[PDB]
Amino acid sequence: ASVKVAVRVRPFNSREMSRDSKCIIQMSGSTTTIVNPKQPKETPKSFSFDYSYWSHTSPEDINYASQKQVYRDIGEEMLQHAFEGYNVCIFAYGQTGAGKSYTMMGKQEKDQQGIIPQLCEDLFSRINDTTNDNMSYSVEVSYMEIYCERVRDLLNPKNKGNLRVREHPLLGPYVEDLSKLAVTSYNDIQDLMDSGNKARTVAATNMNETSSRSHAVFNIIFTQKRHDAETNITTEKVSKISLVDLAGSERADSTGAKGTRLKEGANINKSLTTLGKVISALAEMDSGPNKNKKKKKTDFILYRDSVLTWLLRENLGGNSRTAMVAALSPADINYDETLSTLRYADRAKQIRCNAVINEDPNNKLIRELKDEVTRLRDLLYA
Amino acid sequence: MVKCDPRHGKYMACCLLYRGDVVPKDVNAAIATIKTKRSIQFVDWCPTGFKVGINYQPPTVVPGGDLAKVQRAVCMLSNTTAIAEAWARLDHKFDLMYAKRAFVHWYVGEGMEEGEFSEAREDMAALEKDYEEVGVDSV
Amino acid sequence: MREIVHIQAGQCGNQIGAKFWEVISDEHGIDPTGSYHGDSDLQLERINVYYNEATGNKYVPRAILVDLEPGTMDSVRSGPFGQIFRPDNFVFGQSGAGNNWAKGHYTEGAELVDSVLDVVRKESESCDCLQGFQLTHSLGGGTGSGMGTLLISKIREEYPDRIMNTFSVMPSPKVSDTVVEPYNATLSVHQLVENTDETYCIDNEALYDICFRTLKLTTPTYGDLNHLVSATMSGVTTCLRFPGQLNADLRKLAVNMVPFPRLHFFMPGFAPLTSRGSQQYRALTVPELTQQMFDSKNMMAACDPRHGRYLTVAAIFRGRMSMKEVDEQMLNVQNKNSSYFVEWIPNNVKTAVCDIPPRGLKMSATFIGNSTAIQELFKRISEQFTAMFRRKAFLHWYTGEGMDEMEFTEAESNMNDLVSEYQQYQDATADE
Numbered sequence: 001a002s003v004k005v006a007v008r009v010r011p012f013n014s015r016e017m018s019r020d021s022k023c024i025i026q027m028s029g030s031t032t033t034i035v036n037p038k039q040p041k042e043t044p045k046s047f048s049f050d051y052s053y054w055s056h057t058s059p060e061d062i063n064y065a066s067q068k069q070v071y072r073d074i075g076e077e078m079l080q081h082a083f084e085g086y087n088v089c090i091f092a093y094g095q096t097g098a099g100k101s102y103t104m105m106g107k108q109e110k111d112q113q114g115i116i117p118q119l120c121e122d123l124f125s126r127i128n129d130t131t132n133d134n135m136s137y138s139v140e141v142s143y144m145e146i147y148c149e150r151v152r153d154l155l156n157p158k159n160k161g162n163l164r165v166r167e168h169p170l171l172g173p174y175v176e177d178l179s180k181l182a183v184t185s186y187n188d189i190q191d192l193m194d195s196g197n198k199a200r201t202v203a204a205t206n207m208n209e210t211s212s213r214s215h216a217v218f219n220i221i222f223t224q225k226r227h228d229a230e231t232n233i234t235t236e237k238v239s240k241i242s243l244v245d246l247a248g249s250e251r252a253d254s255t256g257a258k259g260t261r262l263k264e265g266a267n268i269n270k271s272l273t274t275l276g277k278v279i280s281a282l283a284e285m286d287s288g289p290n291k292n293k294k295k296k297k298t299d300f301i302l303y304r305d306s307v308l309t310w311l312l313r314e315n316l317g318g319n320s321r322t323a324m325v326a327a328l329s330p331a332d333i334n335y336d337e338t339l340s341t342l343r344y345a346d347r348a349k350q351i352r353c354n355a356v357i358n359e360d361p362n363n364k365l366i367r368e369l370k371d372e373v374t375r376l377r378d379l380l381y382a
Numbered sequence: 383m384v385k386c387d388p389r390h391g392k393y394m395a396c397c398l399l400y401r402g403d404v405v406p407k408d409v410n411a412a413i414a415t416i417k418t419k420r421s422i423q424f425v426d427w428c429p430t431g432f433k434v435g436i437n438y439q440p441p442t443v444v445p446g447g448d449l450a451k452v453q454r455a456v457c458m459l460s461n462t463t464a465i466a467e468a469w470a471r472l473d474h475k476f477d478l479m480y481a482k483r484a485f486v487h488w489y490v491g492e493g494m495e496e497g498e499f500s501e502a503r504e505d506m507a508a509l510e511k512d513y514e515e516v517g518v519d520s521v
Numbered sequence: 522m523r524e525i526v527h528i529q530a531g532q533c534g535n536q537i538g539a540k541f542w543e544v545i546s547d548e549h550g551i552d553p554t555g556s557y558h559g560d561s562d563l564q565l566e567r568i569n570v571y572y573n574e575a576t577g578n579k580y581v582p583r584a585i586l587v588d589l590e591p592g593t594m595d596s597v598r599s600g601p602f603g604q605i606f607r608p609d610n611f612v613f614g615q616s617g618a619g620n621n622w623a624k625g626h627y628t629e630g631a632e633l634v635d636s637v638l639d640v641v642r643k644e645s646e647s648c649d650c651l652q653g654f655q656l657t658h659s660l661g662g663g664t665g666s667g668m669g670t671l672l673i674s675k676i677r678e679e680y681p682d683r684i685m686n687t688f689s690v691m692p693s694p695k696v697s698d699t700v701v702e703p704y705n706a707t708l709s710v711h712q713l714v715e716n717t718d719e720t721y722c723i724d725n726e727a728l729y730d731i732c733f734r735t736l737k738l739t740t741p742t743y744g745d746l747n748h749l750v751s752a753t754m755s756g757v758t759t760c761l762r763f764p765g766q767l768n769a770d771l772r773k774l775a776v777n778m779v780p781f782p783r784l785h786f787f788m789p790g791f792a793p794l795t796s797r798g799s800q801q802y803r804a805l806t807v808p809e810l811t812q813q814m815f816d817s818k819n820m821m822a823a824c825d826p827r828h829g830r831y832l833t834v835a836a837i838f839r840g841r842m843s844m845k846e847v848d849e850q851m852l853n854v855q856n857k858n859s860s861y862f863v864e865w866i867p868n869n870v871k872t873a874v875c876d877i878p879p880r881g882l883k884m885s886a887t888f889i890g891n892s893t894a895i896q897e898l899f900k901r902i903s904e905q906f907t908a909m910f911r912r913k914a915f916l917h918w919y920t921g922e923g924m925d926e927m928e929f930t931e932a933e934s935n936m937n938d939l940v941s942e943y944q945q946y947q948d949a950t951a952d953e
């Protein structure tokens with residue numbers, strides 16, 4: 001199958017209220033439509049998406065999309081896939097003001113918690129429920145940021161040095177000396193998340209009082225241990241859950257960037273453009289060989305350009321299944337950025353994932369041979 | 383002075399600036415002769431077409447130059463619809479490089495946003511279309 | 522003003538730099554003692570690009586010399602231009618790398634890198650507005666590869682905005698002088714592909730071919746090769762130093778040459794070349810220079826440009842010439858050999874012209890080409906690398922100094938990815 005997509009419309013923000021503006025995004029079911037304020041009665045545009053969330057209201061239930069609804073639609077399925085044995089990935093996208101952080105982190109005070117808190121809550125709830133004598137679980141966490149082509153750890157305390165990126169020949173890219181921490185209670189992961197959000201690098205700008213200056217990646221490694229001592233073995237299934245918050249495209253002149261802020265914006269834009277190029281290339285690549293003939297034309301995707309694409313090698317393509325969450329600003333002034341977000345979300349829809357579960361081939365071959373001898377025994381016994 | 387063929391379009395306005403020993407009788411006769419010819423096409427909604435100015439100071443000659451000393455000189459400023467053609471050529475080149483995002487990271491690394499490219503292109507397309515309608519014959 | 526800082530590492534880099542300094546000095550008129558003895562007034566106008574003032578109306582070059590063997594430093598000091606350099610910039614140690622990349626990069630170089638960086642900071646602080654760096658070294662060696670790569674990494678960390686260049690001598694296909702060339706070359710390219718902003722690929726085999734076929738010499742030595750390389754190095758950055766009709770800063774060359782960040786490997790060339798005793802036959806002009814410049818025999822990279830396509834190209838002329846002739850010739854070259862130029866770049870020839878030609882050359886031209894055919898070179902190294910890594914031929918010497926097989930594997934993968942990228946555009950079709 002392909003990538004999942006969940007577009008969401010953001011409500012007005014005071015910058016778009018002091019300057020007069022109008023709603024432009026409409027949507028019904030799977031379809032989302034935009035009209036060009038530039039010249040109306042010219043060419044309304046529409047796009048198809050698996051999931052779409054309206055958030056202009058809140059007390060009323062008229063197509064309102066609570067964070068819990070978004071979680072139940074995406075994160076529940078992804079947690080189930082993780083328990084099945086697939087590595088799974090969520091990544092947010094949009095522009096400064098879209099609302100990617102609102103969806104990921106949400107607000108600690110509010111009951112409306114973001115995707116990652118609710119996923120952790122449900123994961124620990126199922127761990128508590130399904131623990132038994134013959135079934136046990138292990139969970140460990142990690143949290144990293146990409147500031148300007150440098151990986152920085154968050155749970156690790158103040159450490160002026162950076163962390164090197166190395167490629168294991170079999171397991172692919174990874175980061176060396178990431179403070180990988182275990183967890184046994186929801187309080188521990190909650191405190192770790194709070195500390196990580198505290199230590200993140202954040203700066204203010206005209207588009208958002210508290211904007212993000214760095215991409216953020218939250219990773220959970222989850223192990224199932226089946227301990228029927230008579231028959232089964234432990235550490236059967238290992239799964240990886242990744243949750244990615246990307247920085248919003250900076251328009252420079254509209255954001256009032258200057259000095260260091262401008263250089264941060266430039267680096268963010270370079271990373272985002274590289275991400276767009278890979279996404280388009282990978283989409284074209286999977287689309288072509290799938291329908292054209294089957295030749296496996298050797299046009300390879302290039303991920304070694306930025307650390308963001310390099311570290312997300314597996315999630316974009318390989319043994320991972322994933323979803324894109326594109327936030328949207330309804331203000332008429334933000335027309336071109338909204339169109340770019342829509343087009344790249346549509347392109348991301350064309351991408352194919354190939355998540356597959358793997359275990360020790362010796363054990364798999366032993367089980368297959370056991371099934372074969374069982375079949376032959378049933379044949380001759382009959 | 384620009385590699386475009388004026389015959390493929392229509393002349394919309396013309397200013398002539400004369401320097402030196404020139405008389406209005408001669409320029410009137412010249413304008414009549416140019417109006418007679420068929421290769422020069424004027425849009426229907428500009429029945430006059432021409433503006434004329436005359437100055438007494440003849441042009442000078444720089445030492446070590448290449449132009450000769452002359453008694454009469456003319457400068458024409460013509461507003462035609464042939465220009466578009468040149469613009470069209472340039473647009474083609476832009477597309478051939480923007481399909482692959484070549485050289486874009488240099489621009490992005492200095493504060494530019496990617497989308498700012500596309501907008502400009504669309505803007506250019508708008509101007510060209512308004513230079514193809516301003517010349518359509520009236521009905 | 523645009524100041525350049527120059528660094529030299531290893532035997533090859535030091536000798537090339539010595540010959541290069543002996544050249545630039547003549548172009549600007551500096552005696553071996555330091556005093557200025559020239560004729561024209563343009564020579565002092567932009568002398569601060571390379572030289573610093575000193576109280577006795579003296580000029581000292583802005584160079585840094587690096588090694589881990591005093592022999593090369595002694596040879597350079599005991600020479601015609603030994604007294605021109607600042608003594609404090611002679612950074613060196615003992616117990617050299619011994620043709621081992623690990624010793625250069627991890628064990629021995631890690632001690633001297635701090636002193637080298639202190640000297641670099643002191644030199645760069647005094648500059649009014651620093652433009653970029655440039656470093657000369659050899660990839661197939663020990664000291665050169667390791668210490669040059671380490672210095673490049675550190676300087677890129679400290680000065681992320683400025684330009685970095687490199688004039689690196691790569692291993693040749695057949696004329697070999699070290700048994701463990703492939704390991705050092707691969708480990709060095711793995712970092713050069715990431716850190717630096719431009720790279721010019723020199724090969725000894727190409728220089729010998731030029732010397733024997735074009736120059737018609739009988740006993741070429743390393744002095745002549747250093748001459749050719751110095752000529753090219755001086756010609757690349759002429760427009761910072763002399764006036765002209767179309768200037769070309771280093772940054773402008775960087776923007777026009779590389780279309781994507783990872784493809785910054787170039788083949789250089791210089792024209793003309795009359796081999797002497799036959800100067801009276803050849804008529805020197807613009808089309809003759811263009812004819813000699815695009816020919817395959819002239820290239821210094823030891824790779825045929827006819828096996829690929831030119832991603833793009835830049836030409837820097839020096840002389841008094843007409844602009845129409847230059848533009849017409851570049852257009853003619855593009856239209857005639859239409860197969861060998863990529864088709865999705867409508868015009869892929871950058872042009873610059875400067876008014877002051879070399880001392881005794883009414884005209885000259887420098888060539889910087891960026892073509893897919895360079896992939897061949899990398900493939901050779903990669904093949905040889907595999908032939909020695911499948912059985913771990915000489916690996917223990919590296920592992921004793923604090924490395925592991927993972928480093929070799931990732932370096933090989935990165936170079937293979939580079940080869941694949943360059944090959945993606947090489948074939949025809951592609952188009953839209």
Ligand SMILES: CC(=O)O[C@H]1C(=O)[C@@]2(C)[C@H]([C@H](OC(=O)c3ccccc3)[C@]3(O)C[C@H](OC(=O)[C@H](O)[C@@H](NC(=O)c4ccccc4)c4ccccc4)C(C)=C1C3(C)C)[C@]1(OC(C)=O)CO[C@@H]1C[C@@H]2O
Binds near residue numbers: 543544545751756882
């Ligand atoms: C007598 C005469 O003019 O003959 C030429 C000559 O025959 C040719 C063959 C010269 C000659 O070059 C060589 O023979 C040569 C040998 C080994 C490596 C490289 C070159 C020449 O030696 C080289 C010499 O070049 C220069 O002097 C330049 O100004 C050049 N010189 C240096 O590189 C230099 C070296 C050490 C100290 C100072 C300068 C230069 C370029 C830029 C800035 C400053 C200087 C020139 C024109 C000639 C001879 C003498 C035969 C050529 O070289 C240059 C750089 O001009 C080889 O290709 C050119 C074409 C010339 O026609």
Ligand SMILES: Nc1ncnc2c1ncn2[C@@H]1O[C@H](COP(=O)(O)OP(=O)(O)NP(=O)(O)O)[C@@H](O)[C@H]1O
Binds near residue numbers: 013247
């Ligand atoms: N559904 C929503 N309901 C209420 N406020 C929202 C909603 N979506 C977004 N916002 C608000 O929109 C503002 C910006 O959201 P944010 O997530 O910071 O945007 P972004 O596009 O992710 N940019 P950045 O902060 O740099 O990551 C905040 O005030 C959010 O609370």
Ligand SMILES: Nc1nc2c(ncn2[C@@H]2O[C@H](COP(=O)(O)OP(=O)(O)O)[C@@H](O)[C@H]2O)c(=O)[nH]1
Binds near residue numbers: 534
């Ligand atoms: N072009 C050129 N190449 C050289 C010169 N001297 C040595 N080399 C090359 O440098 C390589 C050896 O590198 P080396 O200088 O020993 O590296 P180092 O030991 O780290 O300084 C050999 O392949 C030689 O061909 C020179 O003067 N000119």
